[PDB]
Amino acid sequence: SVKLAGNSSLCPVSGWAIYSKDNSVRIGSKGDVFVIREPFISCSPLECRTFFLTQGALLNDKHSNGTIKDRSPYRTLMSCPIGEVPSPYNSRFESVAWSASACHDGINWLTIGISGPDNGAVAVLKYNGIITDTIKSWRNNILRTQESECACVNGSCFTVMTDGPSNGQASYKIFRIEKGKIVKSVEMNAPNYYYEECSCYPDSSEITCVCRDNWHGSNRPWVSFNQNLEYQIGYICSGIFGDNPRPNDKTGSCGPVSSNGANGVKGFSFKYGNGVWIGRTKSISSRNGFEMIWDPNGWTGTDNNFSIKQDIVGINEWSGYSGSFVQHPELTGLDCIRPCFWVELIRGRPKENTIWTSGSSISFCGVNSDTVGWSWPDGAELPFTIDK
Amino acid sequence: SVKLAGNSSLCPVSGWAIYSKDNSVRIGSKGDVFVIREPFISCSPLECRTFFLTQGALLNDKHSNGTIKDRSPYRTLMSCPIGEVPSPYNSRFESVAWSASACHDGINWLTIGISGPDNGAVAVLKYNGIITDTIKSWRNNILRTQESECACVNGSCFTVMTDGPSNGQASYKIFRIEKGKIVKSVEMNAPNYYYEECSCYPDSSEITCVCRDNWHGSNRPWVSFNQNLEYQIGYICSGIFGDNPRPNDKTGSCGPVSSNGANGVKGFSFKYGNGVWIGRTKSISSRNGFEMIWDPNGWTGTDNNFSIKQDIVGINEWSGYSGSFVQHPELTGLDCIRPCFWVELIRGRPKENTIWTSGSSISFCGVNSDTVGWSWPDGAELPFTIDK
Amino acid sequence: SVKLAGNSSLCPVSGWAIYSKDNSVRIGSKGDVFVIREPFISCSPLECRTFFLTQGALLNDKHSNGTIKDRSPYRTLMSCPIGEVPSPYNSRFESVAWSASACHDGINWLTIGISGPDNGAVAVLKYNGIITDTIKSWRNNILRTQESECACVNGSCFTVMTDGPSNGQASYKIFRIEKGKIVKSVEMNAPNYYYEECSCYPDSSEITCVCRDNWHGSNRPWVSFNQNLEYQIGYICSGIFGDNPRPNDKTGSCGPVSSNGANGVKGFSFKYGNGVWIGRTKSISSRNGFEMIWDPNGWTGTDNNFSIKQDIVGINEWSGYSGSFVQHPELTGLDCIRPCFWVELIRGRPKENTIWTSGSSISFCGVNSDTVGWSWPDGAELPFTIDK
Amino acid sequence: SVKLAGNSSLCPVSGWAIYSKDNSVRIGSKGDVFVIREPFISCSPLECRTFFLTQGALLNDKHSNGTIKDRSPYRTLMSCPIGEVPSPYNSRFESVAWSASACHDGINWLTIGISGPDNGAVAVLKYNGIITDTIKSWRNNILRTQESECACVNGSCFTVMTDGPSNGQASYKIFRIEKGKIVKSVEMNAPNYYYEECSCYPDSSEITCVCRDNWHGSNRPWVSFNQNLEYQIGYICSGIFGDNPRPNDKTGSCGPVSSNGANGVKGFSFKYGNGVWIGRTKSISSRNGFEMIWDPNGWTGTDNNFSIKQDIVGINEWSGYSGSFVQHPELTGLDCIRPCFWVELIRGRPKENTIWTSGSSISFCGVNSDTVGWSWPDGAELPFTIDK
Ligand SMILES: *[C@@H]1O[C@H](CO[C@@H]2O[C@@H](C)[C@@H](O)[C@@H](O)[C@@H]2O)[C@@H](O[C@@H]2O[C@H](CO)[C@@H](O[C@@H]3O[C@H](CO[C@H]4O[C@H](CO)[C@@H](O)[C@H](O)[C@@H]4O)[C@@H](O)[C@H](O)[C@@H]3O)[C@H](O)[C@H]2NC(C)=O)[C@H](O)[C@H]1NC(C)=O
Ligand SMILES: *[C@@H]1O[C@H](CO)[C@@H](O[C@@H]2O[C@H](CO)[C@@H](O)[C@H](O)[C@H]2NC(C)=O)[C@H](O)[C@H]1NC(C)=O
Ligand SMILES: CCC(CC)O[C@@H]1C=C(C(=O)O)C[C@H](N)[C@H]1NC(C)=O
Ligand SMILES: CCC(CC)O[C@@H]1C=C(C(=O)O)C[C@H](N)[C@H]1NC(C)=O
Ligand SMILES: CCC(CC)O[C@@H]1C=C(C(=O)O)C[C@H](N)[C@H]1NC(C)=O
Ligand SMILES: CCC(CC)O[C@@H]1C=C(C(=O)O)C[C@H](N)[C@H]1NC(C)=O
Ligand SMILES: *[C@@H]1O[C@H](CO)[C@@H](O)[C@H](O)[C@H]1NC(C)=O
Ligand SMILES: *[C@@H]1O[C@H](CO)[C@@H](O)[C@H](O)[C@H]1NC(C)=O
Ligand SMILES: *[C@@H]1O[C@H](CO)[C@@H](O)[C@H](O)[C@H]1NC(C)=O
Ligand SMILES: *[C@@H]1O[C@H](CO)[C@@H](O)[C@H](O)[C@H]1NC(C)=O
Ligand SMILES: *[C@@H]1O[C@H](CO)[C@@H](O)[C@H](O)[C@H]1NC(C)=O
Ligand SMILES: *[C@@H]1O[C@H](CO)[C@@H](O)[C@H](O)[C@H]1NC(C)=O
Ligand SMILES: *[C@@H]1O[C@H](CO)[C@@H](O)[C@H](O)[C@H]1NC(C)=O
Ligand SMILES: *[C@@H]1O[C@H](CO)[C@@H](O)[C@H](O)[C@H]1NC(C)=O
Ligand SMILES: *[C@@H]1O[C@H](CO)[C@@H](O)[C@H](O)[C@H]1NC(C)=O
Ligand SMILES: *[C@@H]1O[C@H](CO)[C@@H](O)[C@H](O)[C@H]1NC(C)=O
Ligand SMILES: [Ca+2]
Ligand SMILES: [Ca+2]
Ligand SMILES: [Ca+2]
Ligand SMILES: [Ca+2]
Ligand SMILES: [Ca+2]
Ligand SMILES: [Ca+2]
Ligand SMILES: [Ca+2]
Ligand SMILES: [Ca+2]
């Protein structure tokens, strides 16, 4: 075992090849599948795994009732192999958690699991399953983190957490973690900005995070930083607005776009010089559909012109959260860090007549070979037996 | 860990010893068993696995409704250990797929998973579960592949894909794949021939495939080739016709036999000089029964005389797809490549009064020791609870 | 990895410590557990496993109907870790089989699985899961074998099979198998004797088998042999009759005891010079209760006196088949071969009002430390939901 | 593999970080989850596992009826990975038992499983799953042991067993066990003391146990001993009484506190010089709530003054058994033995209107980083379908 180097560049990609689909909700109609949300993928040098926050309940059982609720003591972070349904019979226990991150440094898994009360939550860090550190809410208002993989470069792993309001200015901190021990943190000077649920990736020994502005931005904030936590901040300039909700595409801004700026959805994007691969919902108002857009000047330019669009979920089908993951050269044998993404397909409440809320997933990896647009939706027929 | 050599000849065999049976449909009446079709077996130097295309649904659940349908975004290629029922709790996720192939080169698994729309399908190629290449539809008309194992020789693996009409001339391509990367492909010049769902095996460093003529052939087409994809083509001459449907046995042809030629079923045969071991259904009109027939001049001769018949499934019992798989010397310690086969036992629609279609399997290995004819059918009592 | 020597003597034992209980039937009331009979235990140098003949059906499902039936094409030999319920989700497929044996030579697993028609059945032998030999019925009348572990000495494994009538003189053969290849077999000269379902163990480089006389013996036949298949034969002389059914205990015989001699139950016994540890039912007429008796002159003396009895299952509780297994010094680190046994607890037909027949198990290992008699019965409440 | 040294001292801790939660009862409403009680956690140098005593029945199935009952032949000691639900599909079978202990010496697991009748129970000792010894009841009155992990130092493992009345003076023995073989045992001279369900841990090469006085003590008894089983005895002096039931806090005693002394619950405490970390229920009269309390002079001082209290389960929520477990330097890489604990969250009879009694778990590890009080209760909604 050796540390992931994390020093090559992102592989340039022309399209996205489908990687996994788990059909969890479809299968949970009969089988024993966890009620989950906030799924994400992360890879070691040997395998890729789906992480997810369970609700301590299975689909189509009565304890699935009320799972629209975000935070409870029943929620646990757990993981299974990519593409498998998250079942009590195939899933490894990670942490007690209603917000979470994980990532593999090349040697062992780091996991971060926040539980406790809204006014004094605690992140428990584990390295190879052993508790190695904790960090407690500093603003006493729902300490929260990525809901996707943390990022590793040369034995140090990096994440972002937020504490404070979700409808106004909050506090955002960046952490450096080595063998599960926080060795440095910095609070971001980001007035008039808002970061949550950061999708962070390594690229040439530095970390880039694209996040959710729930306060007043329908474009996505970003923060990048080096191993010493010296950071830079911005918003994606493209007029192809990345958040949900959002306005129709028009002239963008390098600051937060206030039109339709309140609320949000967890998302991601990949920076390639001045350009950007944007993943987003197809609907401007609800979590429906998904598409990947290549905008060759979208990182720094404000026009709404793009070069490529690839359909992933159709506009009438349910989507939800999305995030980045990467495959490092140590895993693939390439000479670059490969970009991939997952989409959470949220089913049930609040949009459907169920007592429950849960998600299945799909993921894709970046390639330079031929690809195609389509729709790979969840496909469960709601309501279920328990609802009726 | 070492590449499969694939340079020895096929073991001569006098009969077929039963190797597995999963009883998947019988078990899925209560257990959590995927609805599947298109199963196949493939071996590494250490184990044999069953690969299959799920419908993203479990048996006796309402999501099994309409699983007569061949292609959807829910279908996934998964695998389990030979003879186990395909459950979400024992199945390894491979790829998102409504048509597939897989094989092991002696170092890692290659998997091939075709998904997307009928007019622009994409094969995703994975080596050790990492995406390593893609190939897209070149006739825009249901890109499709073997539904059985690809074949490997000295580090290269080979498969066949079809694109175009299923009731006429189509286009047929052969591929050389090393470590999941397509290193060469050739389009077959095969006018008035039709190939699909090819069953391919290695034999003396070369590949022989026996396929399905869905256009106008009630005997089976074949294609053989070397590692440079220089090929030869033909049809099995035996008057013991291999496809289903087909006419009653009579004088054969070394080109397509047009009588009952349209439509077909995936199948296989093994070439031994001028002779041929034929697997086929017992009914001439539907997928019922299965039998193995040794015809010592059937590869190249057109008479309907044969020397050995061994019963596998009784004529009143449902059958379906069948395909070759091999066990290499590296696995067996023999000095030859051992032929084996599997049979898909299809239950439900169109022939039975259910909302669903699914399959169990049985598999047999060639030996020169004493064997017996019998019937090992699926054994499920239809309809199921969900149908009623 | 080294061959089991098999050259030490049986360990002297004063009593039996409980080793495992799986509660299969109790648990299959709700969970997915196989309908099984003919369970047995066998150990490698690293673990012990339960082997069993499934009925290709789960408990409390409709396909359990009619499982009183002994032979069908749906029956499969499968194995799981000792003490775990036999489920499709924890069980490894071994062979298609309605009669069976298995044993580990120190290097790999040998398995023997008989399937096919009553008038021409075939035993398929596998070594590390690969077919290595077959042997076909020689009397065309239900080729059958041990339903317990075969016995291994220095790289050779030994079993017994019977072919012929179950109500009269039949034919009995002994086999020597190396790496799953039959290297020698002999037919026993045993007129007026009858051997089936032999429980065979190694002891000082020779094999001793205690078996079932279904023709005309209420005491148990035995056969012992050396590695060259030179054999000796006899019946257990003790007046503590070991078969079920049997008479009440009285003066025994060194030939078959005809009183209550027809029919039988698979059983075992362990020889210690002139003495014998007999495992048997508590009832003289049905498969109910179980007890272990030490009779210090019972191998060769005909009195009905014994020195020790240890209760295992109470007289009013269901028992069934039993058999020996051993733990070799390569596994335990002892300087002798440890004797152990399992009991099948048969539930359902013909004695209970169900559509099905199945069994759970218990096992014990011989020790010299303190032990106790009790009852560890099956404990399922019959009938089940599917019966009603 | 190397023996756990066990020679470092206990890590000083300032609070408890949440480590796991299995949600077993919530999940067993639909999933296949064992009815259990008496779980506990123990770790090897590679993993932590949950051990528990099943009732040989699954939740929401009719065989869970009457599971208030402590001792039966159906009860088995099994284990799974920490935080996973105890299911037949993820659980290792360990031993047949209605009382148990287990621990890992750095090389293999020792398991201890007591079954048989109340007047002659036998402890079966296993090392790496092989029977290596037994010990039988020496007072004929429910031989019983820890229900928590044994303690290991330099290849010796230690435990405590009780035999005799649970409402008066009984007999208490300590055992030294090497590779599953009892090498020494001592009967405790403890007149007017009562010990059972001991929680024992290593600390500087010596064992400290904190136990349950069921006779006449509402504080907890303790016994500490060296590797030769030379022991010292006493009761925790703190006026913060540790048992349940108990009186309200007031001046303590260094011998048994008779007020509310009869009856009790399994529990634990960690000694740090003259101080003590106490885990206890929040209710004085029933098994409800749980809290950790640091009393810097509570080992040897009788006042009811304490420094730190940390909430674990809220006072209106069901609690139950609790026990210590440790993580050795060999697992953690620390220079001290880390204390952890678990709490059994009992549901059903006698306090709720069900046919069954079962338990889920939560566990916590000691840290010197920031922590928080909260409530992590069982969370199931009773009654269940089977009760109605
Ligand atoms: C899904 O979940 C909802 C919401 O329920 C809440 O969360 C769930 C998970 C549980 O934790 C509940 O306890 C929570 O309430 C369910 O709605 C609840 O249904 C239950 C069952 O009917 C209701 O509980 C009953 O209420 C009865 C009415 O009592 C009230 O008035 C009487 C005077 O008549 C008075 O005595 C009492 O104090 C109440 O004020 C009561 O008689 C009975 O014993 C029982 O308590 C509960 O009120 C409902 N909650 C809400 C918020 O409406 C759904 O039933 C559930 N659906 C499914 C399909 O499972
Ligand atoms: C049982 O068999 C083993 C062989 O595996 C015998 O052990 C060997 O004996 C020879 C001397 O004849 C030595 O050269 C070897 O070193 C021994 N090998 C091992 C691994 O110990 C043993 O003598 C036989 N025991 C009995 C009881 O007959
Ligand atoms: C805490 C505020 C935050 C942003 C509105 O809510 C998140 C939004 C969510 C959402 O918009 O779907 C669901 C997340 N599970 C939740 N996070 C937490 C920690 O509860
Ligand atoms: C698409 C043409 C082809 C031949 C008619 O269809 C096959 C027929 C099938 C059949 O005869 O059973 C099943 C195959 N799953 C299907 N293949 C695809 C890719 O859908
Ligand atoms: C074949 C004769 C034999 C002895 C009567 O029947 C056995 C009796 C059985 C029994 O007495 O319970 C069950 C065995 N499964 C069966 N063996 C086979 C091969 O069917
Ligand atoms: C046997 C006396 C002892 C103390 C009353 O009983 C314990 C009480 C129990 C309890 O208070 O919950 C549960 C334990 N399973 C039980 N132990 C046994 C061996 O049955
Ligand atoms: C990246 O790191 C590797 C491994 O330490 C090193 O050998 C290589 O020189 C580095 N490459 C670049 C481009 O910095
Ligand atoms: C990577 O980390 C190691 C250990 O701290 C350090 O020695 C090395 O200089 C780092 N490498 C680079 C290229 O920064
Ligand atoms: C086949 O290949 C192996 C491995 O490369 C080689 O050693 C052997 O000589 C070859 N066999 C034949 C029949 O050519
Ligand atoms: C099957 O599909 C048809 C068509 O939509 C529908 O009418 C019927 O209700 C379905 N049956 C089940 C069991 O879902
Ligand atoms: C097998 O492939 C390797 C790599 O191309 C090559 O070195 C070797 O010559 C090949 N052997 C044969 C028989 O073609
Ligand atoms: C069991 O099988 C018989 C066939 O003999 C059938 O008549 C009966 O209805 C079946 N019973 C159940 C409960 O399915
Ligand atoms: C054990 O088997 C080996 C291999 O056949 C043989 O050489 C040896 O003589 C055997 N030993 C005994 C004691 O039979
Ligand atoms: C603890 O044991 C280790 C391993 O044997 C030893 O090296 C060390 O000296 C010991 N420490 C103490 C404090 O006794
Ligand atoms: C349930 O358990 C009780 C013990 O409390 C037992 O005596 C009774 O017979 C059982 N009742 C049913 C309906 O199974
Ligand atoms: C640990 O055990 C070994 C083996 O008995 C012994 O020789 C050694 O002295 C022991 N170490 C200590 C510190 O007791
Ligand atoms: Ca927003
Ligand atoms: Ca642009
Ligand atoms: Ca045809
Ligand atoms: Ca011919
Ligand atoms: Ca008899
Ligand atoms: Ca006698
Ligand atoms: Ca007490
Ligand atoms: Ca105090």
Author numbering:
A (entry chain A), B (entry chain D), C (entry chain C), D (entry chain B): 82 to 469
The paper states:
NA is a homotetrameric transmembrane glycoprotein responsible for cleavage of sialic acid from the host cell membrane. By blocking NA enzymatic activity, neuraminidase inhibitors (NAIs) prevent new viral particles from being released from the surface of an infected cell, thus stopping the spread of virus in the airways. In this study, we applied a set of experimental techniques using recombinant NA variants to understand the molecular basis of development of oseltamivir resistance in the viral N1 neuraminidase NA2009. To decipher the structural mechanism of resistance, we determined crystal structures of NA2009 mutants in complex with oseltamivir carboxylate.
Three variants (H275Y, H275Y/I223V, and H275Y/S247N NA2009) crystallized in the monoclinic space group with four molecules in the asymmetric unit, representing the tetrameric biological unit. Crystal structures of enzymes containing the H275Y substitution either alone or in combination with other mutations show that the bulkier tyrosine side chain pushes the side chain of the neighboring E277 into the binding site, affecting the binding pose of oseltamivir. Specifically, the position of the pentyloxy substituent of oseltamivir changes relative to that in the wt enzyme; the shift in position of the terminal C atom (C91) is more than 2 Å. The crystal structure provides a direct explanation for the more than 1000-fold reduction in binding affinity for oseltamivir in variants containing the H275Y substitution. A similar effect on oseltamivir binding was previously observed for the H275Y substitution in H5N1 avian influenza neuraminidase. Compared to wt, the sensitivity of the H275Y single mutant to oseltamivir decreased considerably (more than 1000-fold increase in Ki). For the H275Y single mutant, the enthalpy change for oseltamivir binding was substantially affected and was 8.7 kcal mol−1 less favorable than the wt value. This change was only partially compensated by a more favorable entropic contribution of 6 kcal mol−1 (referenced to the wt value). The substantial decrease in strength of oseltamivir binding to the H275Y mutant is caused by a significant loss of binding enthalpy, which is partially compensated by a gain in binding entropy. However, we did not confirm the loss of a hydrogen bond between R152 and the oseltamivir acetyl group, which was proposed by Le and co-workers based on molecular dynamics simulations as an additive molecular mechanism conferring drug resistance in H5N1 and H1N1 strains bearing H275Y mutations.
